[PDB]
Design a protein around this ligand. Structure first.
Ligand code: G4P
Ligand code: MG
Ligand code: ZN
Lengths: 102, 202, 53, 49, 470, 330, 49, 201
DNA sequence: GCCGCGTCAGA
DNA sequence: TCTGACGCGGC
């Protein structure tokens, strides 16, 4: 049955554990993302990727809103992307966000 | 963590900041503004303030609040009195020194080009020091039971005036009681220059 | 029971302890419990004591 | 009146909880997916009873 | 040869092995050459008079430290400067001070010869000679630093001439600045700083002697002698390079790779060669061997584990492991811990129980578990230092509920007192005295008011709701 | 508008790396064996990365709401949320500059195209097998000339000074620094102007494009060789303890510990004025360690742990099906 | 080799920017699907594949 | 615990509002009123320049608006106008000093009855030009301070000072060059605050 | 101008 | 396994 609502997250990626060993939970496949793109349900795809998995600020805010019942959405950034930028930053190549007026 | 301070030679506030750092006993890197490349010196501050100090995420170029920020950042023995009333009085005294000290140093430094004009300023300064002579007596460094930031402010003026060839100890009126004591503090005795000389320079 | 230190309780928690005169435990409990949805009876129990004591 | 009280009542599987769950899920959609999502048709949304 | 082989060890060994092995007679000749070079350098260094005065001043500082020791049957013993050269040392120092004063006042040659002979009688190996060379070298280095600073300040500012180096190079006159006033480099603050630096240079010269040229030639002679000694030492070391590889063979799987072990052995050999003397007749290999062995053991202990472990702790653990290996084979029984404590130099029982506790190296997270559901240890580890969202949510409800309760109770004075004493949204958590000053009255009344507020809030209507959180 | 609409990737200068690093690590110490707390200058050192606990100094002397931004004099650790440790970065000083592994082994290597010389000869110069003349002098020998050690000695005897033939990373960096883009591009185009690209000219097309791209970027060519390397934050490489009284350790931590100690040994050897052959061996070992850390096994057999499994490089984590781009991002 | 989108915009920029300016002459080429994907302008999309 | 005040003075009005937030015992005394000439003479004896507003206490007497505000904050544990974090406090102090020098001095100069038309026009134009920048900086600082601590229940002195400056601009009849509806609505909301109304009426 | 040997990189 | 691409060394 493997029923899970809220579970502990991986320390390195802040992401849910899998296989039902502790709280388990179902990983979302890349192919499933392609099917979502074919559907055109961007709102479902954007929410699942950030608040549902690695958004630390989003998950707490989402839980408070669900308990409150009021409607609000916060998806500033995904932590995995920041971890990837830090890994690239350690190497000589530099990656940073920028604003282009051109 | 690592903190560095940028200072300009012959600046009273820069000396005050160095003395405060010595009292705080926090290890810091001191870099002369002149040694840095001129374009690089302009880059750090567009306005160009010689005494600012350096931090990884923050920079302060304001001397008026710089001493207060240095005191708040470090929880080491404070330069301000514990008693609320003394703390309030000390701030007013600091404002009094800051509000009208331009004539004492700036006017003599640039305005008094004539040797007689420097001499005319010196007599008035001596009379003002004599008037200040009838003031606090027997205070350890000022109107406080413990060493205070205001005492640090006096040290910068004393060294700057001495560099101006105006040295008064027994001719400065009855302020000799605290002038000798102020030099006693290790941080204050850093104004100017066989084994001892080499070790001291190191 | 496993001990804990440096609890650093927040001020609201401190006020709650003061209102009910509730002390803060320096120890925590980590007992072994059967997982939910599992029911059974204890047929056998095994215990091993310390060595040199 | 409290999150902890609600969790404790939920733990005991109180009878009133089932009716509230039925009201909450009455008009709420759910997504069913399979391990091999070859095409978008594989993922679909149904109303749970 | 140059085959493009990637591995460094093969490339390094080919260069190291090229030098042929040297017989004992060659080693003795190299040692004699190094000794003669060292004697020549010491004779040149002791020639200058100021060095003797500096030595007397350093001994006077040691005397002041000895006086400090008494304040806290024999004079305090400090012999760091002189090793195997304290009553005899003190008497020799007193004779030296009086003789040095007499030589400075009147004697030209005889007193100097007597002082040189007494110094030759004094015996020093490497550290003291190095200190004397630094004493001559340090003043010149400081003067050079001052000259560099003056050149940097004036050269860029004074028209940036650069090419006209000789005129600026005249030093200590401090009279070119007045002519430069007509010319460029009109920096009055810079001029004052330069005059101060030149004044410092003149003071340094007065303490040491005359112009820079007096010390520059001495530094050049010292450098030439040091270069000769260094060449002799390098020639001796290159032949003995293989010794570290030979010693390194015994430890190849102690958790340190061969290259680092070889580097540690080379570091041990270089330090060992300088100390050994040819006066006693023995092979240098054993003197080098002890130093190489000590260096290798120390390196293995220092970098043996990812977590640093004390060398003394590691050696006791090694002794215990050897004793356990001997007991298990001789009597079969694996532990016999009481028997193990029966015949050991450790002389502790608690230490063995705590000593073996750190016997496990940290596991690698990425390490595979065979199939194990095709899973790895690193993924299993979970964050335990961060509050979970359910943990975050409950705290928010409790904090919000308390503020409503405070408003529902006292009109304003009790709520204000409760916030100030406990501190809610209050930066300093002000004490009772501050709250009493805030009203300007009721300095002790504040505690009574807080007690009344606590009694009122302890009633069941508010107490029961908040009881669930605790 | 408070939103970043664009993303750009550029080479990082040494000054930029220094700005990124909040602290400098001199000794490779991770944790005290008796007590699981940060070392004073360790890679897990609390002062540079940050406080383990929120608003708590490592000593714990400063533990109250009254001081939040205050820094304890007793310890370097600042009072702040523990989350800062993850985003906090550190830098390690290098006594000798190390050429980047990715550019040298680009296949096509960028450094080889820029120097217009074979990759094997550059590797030989890097290993110290050959000597390259940095300064042409009045001597006939070309600047891009490889000289054998006996040949180098003969050239020094015949000409003495007036020419420089340094070896290792420093010589390559000096050659990159002393290059004029404007002079090289105009001559290269002139070869292009006489277009004979049936065979020889086809290779020259890439060099002109590379030079133009470098000029447009404004990035220094010598930047490819790194004089200093930044250190990844501790949370990205956790040493947290696990059941059985054991601590899981990341592969990156072992490489970082080895590199720091090797650099310290090299500095000590330079201070002692030890023999040149030993110094060359230390320089080669440090270069190999840096290459292994960025990506192990790229040009050599990969270093392995007691388990014998090859260690995971930083490049390995970002790439592959198990790689970060496709494993966790999707 | 150059992108068709880049050529058309560059041709358009010089198409009426001053006069005709001989903006461009091009012949279409055929590439493998993997070769086309790696040739994509966005580095992140190419890097992920 | 007596504060000397002069009517039609921006600094005195701000000090009175700060005391009203404290709700302490403030014995306001008007130097201008002839009803208390002797008290004004005593203020002149205590203070050399008779600067207003002057806060008077038995232990000590202080002058200067910034010093008076800092002393009031030390004296009262009532909700603070300063941030808990030291860097934030330093930034707030620098912002207050800049606002006081750029606008307060111009307001004091305009207060004099011997003003020249050209000087008054230039001062008004500069104040209108910098008002938008000052308001934007204050809003940004307030948001940053709020992010660090939630539900702190701490009132920011800088926002109150900006509201007082806007009220004086309205009283002078000067025109504010803002085309944004949001800015006007926010300024109106700040003017509508209940505690501010008690001093204004 | 080319045969024939080679690296890499994904399955 | 393999495919190719890309190579780049022999002549
Ligand atoms: N009427 C009045 N004016 C005030 C008050 N507080 C400050 N000022 C004036 O505002 C100006 C700014 O003062 P500060 O910012 O405190 O000092 P600063 O000049 O070093 O910045 C000063 O002009 P200044 O010419 O620099 O003054 P001074 O220091 O030269 O006497 C000061 O006189 C106050 O409460 N009432
Ligand atoms: Mg002023
Ligand atoms: Zn601490």
């Amino acid at each position: 049955m493997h029923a899970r609502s809220t579970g502990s997250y991986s320390l390195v990626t802040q992401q849910p554990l899998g296989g039902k060993a502790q709280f388990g939970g179902q990983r979302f496949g890349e192919m499933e993302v392609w099917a979502l793109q074919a559907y055109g349900a961007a709102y479902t795809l954007r929410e699942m990727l950030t608040v549902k998995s690695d958004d630390i600020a989003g998950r707490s805010k989402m839980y408070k809103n669900i308990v409150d019942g009021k409607l609000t959405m916060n998806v500033d950034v995904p932590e995995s992307f920041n971890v990837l930028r830090n890994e690239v930053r350690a190497l000589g190549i530099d990656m940073d966000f920028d604003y282009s007026s051109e | 963590m690592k903190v560095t301070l940028y200072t300009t030679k012959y600046c009273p506030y820069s000396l005050r900041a160095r003395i405060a750092l010595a009292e705080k006993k926090m290890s810091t890197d001191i870099v002369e503004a002149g040694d840095l490349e001129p374009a690089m010196i302009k880059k750090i501050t567009p306005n160009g303030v010689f005494p600012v100090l350096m931090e990884k995420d923050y920079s302060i170029n304001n001397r008026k609040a710089l001493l207060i920020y240095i005191d708040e950042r470090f929880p080491a023995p404070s330069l301000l009195p514990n008693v609320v009333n003394e703390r309030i009085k000390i701030r007013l005294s600091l404002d009094k020194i800051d509000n009208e000290w331009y004539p004492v140093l700036d006017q003599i430094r640039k305005h008094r080009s004539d040797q007689k004009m420097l001499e005319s300023m010196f007599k008035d300064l001596k009379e003002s020091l004599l008037a200040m002579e009838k003031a606090f007596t027997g205070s350890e460094f000022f109107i406080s039971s413990g060493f205070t930031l205001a005492d640090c402010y006096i040290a910068a003026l004393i060294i700057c005036l001495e560099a101006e060839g105006f040295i008064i100890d027994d001719e400065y009126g009855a302020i000799y009681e605290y002038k000798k004591r102020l030099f006693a503090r290790d941080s204050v005795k850093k104004a100017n220059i066989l084994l001892k000389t080499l070790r001291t320079h190191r | 029971i496993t001990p804990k230190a440096e609890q650093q309780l927040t001020p609201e928690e401190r006020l709650l302890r003061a209102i009910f005169n509730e002390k803060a435990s320096n120890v925590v409990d980590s007992s072994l419990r059967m997982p939910s949805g599992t029911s059974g009876t204890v047929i056998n129990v095994q215990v091993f004591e310390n060595d040199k004591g | 009146t409290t999150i902890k009280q609600a969790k404790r009542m939920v733990e005991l599987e109180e009878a009133v909880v089932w009716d509230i769950l039925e009201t909450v899920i009455n008009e709420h959609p759910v997504l069913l997916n399979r391990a091999p999502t070859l095409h978008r048709l594989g993922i679909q949304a149904f109303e749970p009873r | 040869l140059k085959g493009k082989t990637s591995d460094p060890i093969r490339m390094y060994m080919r260069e190291m092995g090229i030098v042929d092995l040297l017989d004992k007679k060659g080693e003795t000749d190299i040692a004699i050459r190094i000794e003669e070079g060292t004697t020549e350098v010491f004779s040149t260094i002791l020639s200058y008079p100021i060095v003797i005065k500096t030595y007397i001043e350093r001994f006077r500082e040691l005397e002041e430290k000895a006086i400090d020791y008494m304040n806290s049957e024999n004079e305090p013993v400090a012999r760091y400067i002189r090793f195997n050269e304290t009553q005899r040392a003190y008497e020799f120092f007193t004779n030296l001070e009086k003789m040095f004063e007499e030589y400075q006042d009147k004697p030209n040659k005889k007193l100097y010869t007597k002082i040189v002979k007494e110094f030759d009688n004094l015996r020093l190996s490497t550290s003291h000679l190095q200190k004397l060379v630094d004493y001559i070298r340090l003043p010149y280095a400081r003067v050079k630093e001052f000259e560099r600073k003056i050149l940097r300040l004036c050269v860029e500012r004074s028209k940036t001439p650069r090419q006209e180096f000789i005129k600026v190079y005249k030093v200590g006159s401090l009279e070119w600045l007045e002519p430069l006033t007509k010319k460029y480099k009109f920096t009055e603050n810079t001029i004052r700083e330069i005059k101060n630096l030149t004044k410092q240079i003149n003071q340094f010269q007065i303490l040491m002697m005359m112009d820079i040229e007096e010390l520059k030639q001495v530094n050049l002679e010292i450098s030439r002698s040091e270069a000769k000694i260094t060449q002799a030492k390098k020639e001796m070391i290159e032949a003995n390079l293989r010794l570290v590889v030979s010693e390194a063979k015994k430890y190849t799987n102690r958790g340190l790779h061969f290259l680092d072990i070889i580097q540690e052995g080379n570091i041990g050999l270089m330090k060992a060669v300088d100390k050994f003397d040819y006066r006693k007749g023995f092979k240098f290999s054993t003197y080098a061997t002890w130093w190489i062995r000590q260096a290798i053991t120390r390196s293995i202990a220092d970098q043996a584990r990812t977590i640093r472990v004390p060398v003394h702790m590691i050696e006791t653990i090694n002794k215990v492991n050897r004793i356990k290996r001997q007991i298990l084979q001789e009597k079969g029984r694996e532990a016999t811990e009481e028997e193990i404590i029966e015949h050991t130099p450790n002389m502790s029982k608690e230490k063995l129980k705590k000593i073996l506790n750190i016997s496990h190296t940290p596991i690698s997270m990425e390490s595979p578990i065979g199939d194990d559901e095709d899973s790895t240890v690193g993924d299993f580890i979970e964050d335990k230092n961060n509050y979970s969202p359910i943990e975050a949510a409950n705290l928010e409800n409790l904090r919000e509920a308390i503020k409503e309760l405070i408003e529902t109770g006292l009109t304003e004075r009790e709520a204000k007192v409760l916030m100030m004493r406990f501190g809610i949204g209050m930066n300093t958590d002000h004490t009772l005295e501050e709250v009493g000053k805030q009203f300007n009255v009721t300095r002790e009344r504040i505690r009574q008011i807080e007690a009344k507020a606590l009694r009122k809030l302890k009633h069941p209507s508010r107490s029961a709701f908040l009881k669930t959180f605790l | 508008s408070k939103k970043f609409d664009i993303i750009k990737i550029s080479l990082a200068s040494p000054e930029v790396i220094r700005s990124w690093s909040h602290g400098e690590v001199k000794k490779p110490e991770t944790i005290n064996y008796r007590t699981f707390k940060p070392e004073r200058d360790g890679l897990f050192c609390a002062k540079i990365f940050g406080p383990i606990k929120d608003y708590e100094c490592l000593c714990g002397k400063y533990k109250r709401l009254k001081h939040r931004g205050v820094v304890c004099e007793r310890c370097g650790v600042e009072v702040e949320q523990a989350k800062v440790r993850r985003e906090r970065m550190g830098h390690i000083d290098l006594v000798c500059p190390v050429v980047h592994i990715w550019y040298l082994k680009s296949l096509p290597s960028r450094i080889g195209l820029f120097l217009d010389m074979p990759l094997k000869n550059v590797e030989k110069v890097l290993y110290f097998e050959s000597y390259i003349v940095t300064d042409p002098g009045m001597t006939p020998l070309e600047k891009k000339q490889l000289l054998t050690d006996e040949e180098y000695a003969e050239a020094l005897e015949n000409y003495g000074y007036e020419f420089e033939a340094s070896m290792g990373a420093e010589a390559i960096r000096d050659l990159l620094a002393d290059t004029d883009i404007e002079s090289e591009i105009e001559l290269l185009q002139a070869e292009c102007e006489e277009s004979k690209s049936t065979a020889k000219k086809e290779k020259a097309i890439k060099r002109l494009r590379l030079l133009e791209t470098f000029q447009a970027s404004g990035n220094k060519p010598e930047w490819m060789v790194m004089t200093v390397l930044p250190v990844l934050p501790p949370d990205l490489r956790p040493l947290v303890p696990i059941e059985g009284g054991r601590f899981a350790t990341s592969d990156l931590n072992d490489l970082y510990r080895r590199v720091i100690n090797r650099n310290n040994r090299l500095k000590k050897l330079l201070d002692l004025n030890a023999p040149d052959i030993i110094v060359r061996n230390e320089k080669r070992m440090l270069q190999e360690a840096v290459d292994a850390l960025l990506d192990n096994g790229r040009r050599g057999r990969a270093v392995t742990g007691s388990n014998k499994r090859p260690l995971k490089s930083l490049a390995d984590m970002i790439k592959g099906k198990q790689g970060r781009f496709r494993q966790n991002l999707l | 080799d150059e992108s068709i989108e880049l050529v058309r915009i560059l041709e358009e920029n010089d198409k009426l920017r001053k006069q005709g300016k001989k903006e461009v002459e091009y012949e279409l080429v055929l590439m493998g699907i993997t070769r086309s994907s790696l040739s994509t302008e966005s580095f992140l999309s190419a890097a992920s594949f | 615990m007596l504060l000397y005040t002069k009517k039609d003075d921006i600094y005195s009005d701000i000090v009175r509002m700060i005391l009203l937030i404290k709700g302490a015992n403030a014995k306001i005394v008007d130097v201008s009123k002839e009803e208390n000439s002797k008290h004004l003479e005593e203020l002149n004896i205590i203070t050399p320049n008779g600067n207003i507003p002057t806060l008077s206490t038995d232990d000590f007497a202080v002058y200067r608006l910034s010093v008076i505000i800092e002393a009031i904050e030390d004296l009262y544990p009532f909700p603070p106008m300063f941030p808990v974090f030291p860097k934030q406090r330093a930034n707030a102090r620098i912002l207050l000093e800049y606002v006081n020098k750029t606008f307060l001095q111009n307001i004091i100069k305009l207060q004099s009855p011997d003003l020249d038309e050209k000087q008054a026009n230039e001062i008004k134009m500069l104040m209108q030009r910098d008002i938008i920048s000052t308001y934007k900086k204050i809003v940004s600082e307030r948001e940053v301070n709020a992010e660090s601590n939630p539900d702190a229940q701490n009132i920011n002195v800088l926002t109150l000072i900006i509201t007082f400056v806007f009220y004086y601009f309205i009283k002078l009849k000067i025109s504010i060059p803002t085309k944004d509806k949001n800015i006007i609505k926010e300024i109106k909301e700040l003017l509508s605050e209940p505690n501010f109304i008690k001093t204004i009426k």
